[PDB]
Design a protein around this ligand. Structure first.
Ligand SMILES: Nc1ncnc2c1ncn2[C@H]1C[C@H](O)[C@@H](COP(=O)(O)NP(=O)(O)OP(=O)(O)O)O1
Ligand SMILES: [Mg+2]
Ligand SMILES: [Mg+2]
Ligand SMILES: [Mg+2]
Ligand SMILES: [Mg+2]
Ligand SMILES: [Mg+2]
Length: 756
DNA sequence: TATAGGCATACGACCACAACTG
DNA sequence: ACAGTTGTGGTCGTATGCCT
């Protein structure tokens, strides 16, 4: 099993290291023969003689073109002759590529910015995380001494907890009488002991929770002051901290630093991403938080360290169990993308697609297009028309079927061969022409991206079959992971076509996919209304809700099935319409906001404040209770009674503050806010003290009683003291609960109620 | 240091104008 | 028979998180 690749330099030459785990033992394979390269397209073949003369300087060492080779490749489905220029060292390329491209004989260069180890995996056809080797996992966390004015890692590390299959322990240097706590003399001895623990256990995966941005940097500052060689890597190296955009990321050579925080942020949608909230969302058990001020007051008085030791231990144990439940999915994703788990777990959608496409391109000898320069990037920032949304027939409908397409945009791409290399290609027998926009796509040869998508969808349907076939939960979970990986990749390709930073960008493919989707959806709607007597209540991008207005459930169902058999005979290629489900009642409030209930009583809710993080739980829960009373029981008096009880408990200050927290994400540097709202005000105040606010931080605040601007009365929920502070009852009544419930009531048809 | 676009929703920022102040 | 602050109704663009 390949765990990772990197490279070192020996006497000026790059040496690839492949970190593998085979039949239970760790191994390092060295490759000294791999050369970096780029491609150049030239106007005159005779001009190469004076492109071998191009030289640069790295920082005092002179950089030359090691050798050249004339090659034939496909670019956008057409044959091209280019020159492959090799260099001695991958750092040569950034220094000389600019003088090459800006040569008069050079039209353009290609593939000059794929990082060396990624390039190695691609060109050798190696794929990490393959095979059936079992990796050893170990989670760890640290607890530090925090004060507000202090510089980073000013204070010592208090405890280091770690957890694995054997159990969870805490190393610390004040005495604590619990069976799982190991006391040592000093902070220095605690760090040395922890390092000994990792070296003894020798895990393949080190799991943290935001270790990328706190734990490893804290450990590094402390080891620099204490004089520790923090030799965590299997080759004896220290963790390697590097800048990734606006944040940092940490490698531990020979192991995999699995930082759960990015993984979970992009895998599940939660109102807040504290470790406590994540753990209770994933496993349903609560976990108590101890705040830094508490930990410090405790440490300085020696008072209640048993409580803080338990907090530290629990941090480690839940980090271990979360890692153990999220790792397999991320390993399947990494096996599909074809890159190391460290890379895939930290990467955005665009780069995952890019890495997959570069590998497939390499297999097919297709030259990769370049990332846009600044001018082209600015040019691609015009938007295009999106999917079709019918304005709903608002209100309460009975006996509803939902019909939708199976993978609409990928099906369109596959059926109509929508690709930059088939767009307006000349000289073909057969074309498909997108509606309303007129883009023509050759049908005589499969395009690059359509063929890849074909393979992906075929194998996802094979998997969905043999998933429920197997009796084995072993293989059922492995197949579910593989199938969900395929889905994420496949449904990112429509978006990638329109991603301004994409290599295989094509605005006309994005526009054509939209046009064909709008056509298929609206034409199917017309067919069910004209030929089958259905009324279409609501429609969004790829499906629609419909009923036969006077008909009972069984005739609605059977007519829908007849329509499905009729429409699918007519749909071309991979296009197919499916029966998603039947709903006894549905409440369509507005575009993107509605709720339906099935015959068994289960309510599903889309778009309503019920699902959003930036609405307080008192409002979300009252809206759900009003929704259940109206859509499940049809009891308006019960709903009015519910609202009256909640507004009364609010105005008597009886509702616990945790049900009043509002969560909103900071989406940018605080400097770049032109309108400063409550969560921005809170975050700016926090930044003016110690707290570092980066994009994606979730601010959780509560609105205090008082007059004047709400931005000045909102405090972080962490600082709320039910003795000191009183919350703003009237804000939570008038601006949170009543709007959310009155929108439901008005959608049912009950406009005026006392609600007081 | 965004895979896409479409939507509902609330509010801050700005503004013009009136009333009121040393 | 005054500049400067304050209050008072408006737009209108900013911001977020959802949906497919
Ligand atoms: N995150 C996203 N980005 C871009 N387009 C998206 C999207 N989500 C949906 N669409 C657009 C593009 C899609 O073509 C369409 C529906 O995609 P699904 O709702 O994921 N349902 P499907 O049938 O594909 O998977 P399953 O087998 O689970 O039902 O909406
Ligand atoms: Mg921690
Ligand atoms: Mg902690
Ligand atoms: Mg579906
Ligand atoms: Mg988006
Ligand atoms: Mg769908």
């Amino acid at each position: 099993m390949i765990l990772d690749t990197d490279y070192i330099t020996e006497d000026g030459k790059p040496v690839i290291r492949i970190f593998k785990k085979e039949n239970g033992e760790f191994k390092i394979e060295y490759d000294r023969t791999f050369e970096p390269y780029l491609y150049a397209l030239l106007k005159d073949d005779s001009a190469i003689e004076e492109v071998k003369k191009i030289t640069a300087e790295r920082h005092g060492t002179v950089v030359t073109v090691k050798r050249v080779e004339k090659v034939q490749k496909k670019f956008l489905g057409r044959p091209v002759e280019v020159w492959k220029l090799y260099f001695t060292h991958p750092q040569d390329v950034p220094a000389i590529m600019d003088k090459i491209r800006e040569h008069p004989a050079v039209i353009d260069i290609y593939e000059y910015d794929i990082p060396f180890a990624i390039r190695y995996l691609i060109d050798k056809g190696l794929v990490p995380m393959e095979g059936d080797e079992e990796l050893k996992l170990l989670a760890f966390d640290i607890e530090t001494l925090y004060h507000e004015g202090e510089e980073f890692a000013e204070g010592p590390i208090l405890m280091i907890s770690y957890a694995d299959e054997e159990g969870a322990r805490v190393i610390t240097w004040k005495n604590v009488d619990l069976p799982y706590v190991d006391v040592v003399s000093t902070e220095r001895e605690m760090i040395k002991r922890f390092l000994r623990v990792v070296k003894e256990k020798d895990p393949d995966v080190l799991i943290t929770y935001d270790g990328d941005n706190f734990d490893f940097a804290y450990l590094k500052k402390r080891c620099e002051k204490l004089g520790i060689n923090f030799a965590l890597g299997r080759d004896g190296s220290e963790p390697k901290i590097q800048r990734m955009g606006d944040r940092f990321a940490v490698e531990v050579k020979g192991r995999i630093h699995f930082d759960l925080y990015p993984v979970i942020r992009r895998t599940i949608n939660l109102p807040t991403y504290t470790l406590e909230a994540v753990y209770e969302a994933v496993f349903g058990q609560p976990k108590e938080k101890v705040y830094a001020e508490e930990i410090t007051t405790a440490w300085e008085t020696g008072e209640n360290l048993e409580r803080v030791a338990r907090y530290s231990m629990e941090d480690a144990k839940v980090t271990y169990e979360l890692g153990k439940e999220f790792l397999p999915m991320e390993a399947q994703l990494s096996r599909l993308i074809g890159q190391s788990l460290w890379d895939v777990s930290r990467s955005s959608t665009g780069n995952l697609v890019e890495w997959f496409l570069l590998r497939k391109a390499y297999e097919r000898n297709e030259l990769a297009p370049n990332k846009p320069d600044e001018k082209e990037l600015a040019r691609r920032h015009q938007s295009h028309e999106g999917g079709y949304i019918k304005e709903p027939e608002r209100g309460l409908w009975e006996n509803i079927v939902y019909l939708d397409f199976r993978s609409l945009y990928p099906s369109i791409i596959i059926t109509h061969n929508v690709s930059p290399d088939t767009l307006n290609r000349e000289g073909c027998k057969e074309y498909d022409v997108a509606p309303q926009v007129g883009h023509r796509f050759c049908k005589d040869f499969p395009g690059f991206i359509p063929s890849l998508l074909g393979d992906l969808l075929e194998e996802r349907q094979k998997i969905k079959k043999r998933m429920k076939a197997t009796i084995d939960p072993i293989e059922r979970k492995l197949l579910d992971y593989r199938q969900r990986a395929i889905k994420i990749l496949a449904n990112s390709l429509y978006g990638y076509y329109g991603y301004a930073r994409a290599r295989w960008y094509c605005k006309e493919c994005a526009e054509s996919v939209i046009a064909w989707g709008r056509e298929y959806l609206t034409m199917t709607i017309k067919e069910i209304e004209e030929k089958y007597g259905f009324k279409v209540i609501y429609s969004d991008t790829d499906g629609f809700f419909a009923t036969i207005p006077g008909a009972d459930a069984e005739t609605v169902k059977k007519k829908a099935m007849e329509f499905l058999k009729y429409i699918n005979a007519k749909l071309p290629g991979a296009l197919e319409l499916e029966y998603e489900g039947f709903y006894k009642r549905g409440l369509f409030v507005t575009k993107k906001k509605y709720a339906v209930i099935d015959e068994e009583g289960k309510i599903t809710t889309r778009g309503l404040e019920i699902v959003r993080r930036d609405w307080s739980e008192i409002a979300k829960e009252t809206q759900a209770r009003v929704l259940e009373a109206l859509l499940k029981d049809g009891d308006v008096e019960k709903a009015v009674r519910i609202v009256k009880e909640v507004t009364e408990k609010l105005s008597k200050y009886e509702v616990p503050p945790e049900k009043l927290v509002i969560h909103k994400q900071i989406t940018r540097d605080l400097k770049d806010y032109k309108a400063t709202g409550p969560h921005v005000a809170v975050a700016k105040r926090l930044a003016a003290r110690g707290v570092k606010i980066r994009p994606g931080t979730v601010i959780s605040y509560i609105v205090l009683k008082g007059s004047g601007r709400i931005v000045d009365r909102a405090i972080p929920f962490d600082e709320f003291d039910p003795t000191k502070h009183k919350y703003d009852a009237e804000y939570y009544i008038e601006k949170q609960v009543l709007p959310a419930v009155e929108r439901i009531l008005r959608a049912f048809g009950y406009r005026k109620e006392d609600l007081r």
